[PDB]
Amino acid sequence: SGLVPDDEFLRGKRVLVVDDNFISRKVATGKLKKMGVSEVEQCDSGKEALRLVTEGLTQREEQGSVDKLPFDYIFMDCQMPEMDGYEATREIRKVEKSYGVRTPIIAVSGHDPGSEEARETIQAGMDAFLDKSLNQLANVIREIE
Numbered sequence: 576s577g578l579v580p581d582d583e584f585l586r587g588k589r590v591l592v593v594d595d596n597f598i599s600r601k602v603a604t605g606k607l608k609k610m611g612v613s614e615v616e617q618c619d620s621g622k623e624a625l626r627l628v629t630e631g632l633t634q635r636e637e638q639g640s641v642d643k644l645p646f647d648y649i650f651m652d653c654q655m656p657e658m659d660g661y662e663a664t665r666e667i668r669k670v671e672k673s674y675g676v677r678t679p680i681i682a683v684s685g686h687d688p689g690s691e692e693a694r695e696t697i698q699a700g701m702d703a704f705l706d707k708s709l710n711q712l713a714n715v716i717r718e719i720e
Contacts, residue, residue: 576703576711577715578704578718579703579704581611583611585610588647588648589614589615590616590647590649591627591628591648591649591650592604592607593621593623593624593660594617594655594683595652595655596652600619602709603617606712610712616646620655620656620658621658621662624649625670628649629670630645631644632644632645643676644678649678650683652683652684653684653696654685660682661696661698661701662699664699665698667680668700679703682704682705
């Protein structure tokens with residue numbers, strides 16, 4: 576848990592889980608479903624996350640949807656092969672600019688960041704940082720809110 580410079584807790588909310596590990600991804604989605612999440616989507620890579628966000632934001636804009644964000648929250652694994660969660664987040668932020676919106680993106684990491692990771696967390700534009708156990712998931716979302 577921290578900000579970056581229960582069965583109805585998340586009812587009404589749609590979430591994307593980005594995790595390159597099939598087992599922890601399923602653990603994350605199960606936890607979210609149990610907290611009442613109305614829709615959980617999951618993907619296994621930064622490039623897939625970017626695609627889902629890019630397409631969702633266009634689709635909502637073209638439809639004039641009430642909610643313009645396709646996901647109310649995104650739980651992004653920091654370390655993944657190919658496009659890691661820093662780079663995916665930076666690209667998401669660039670895509671969001673022409674919509675005037677900002678998705679809450681929570682960096683999910685198995686260890687405290689060092690200096691270089693901490694810097695990348697801020698520069699990519701993540702909103703919070705959360706341990707891989709997800710035990711502080713609810714406290715972090717209320718901090719964001």
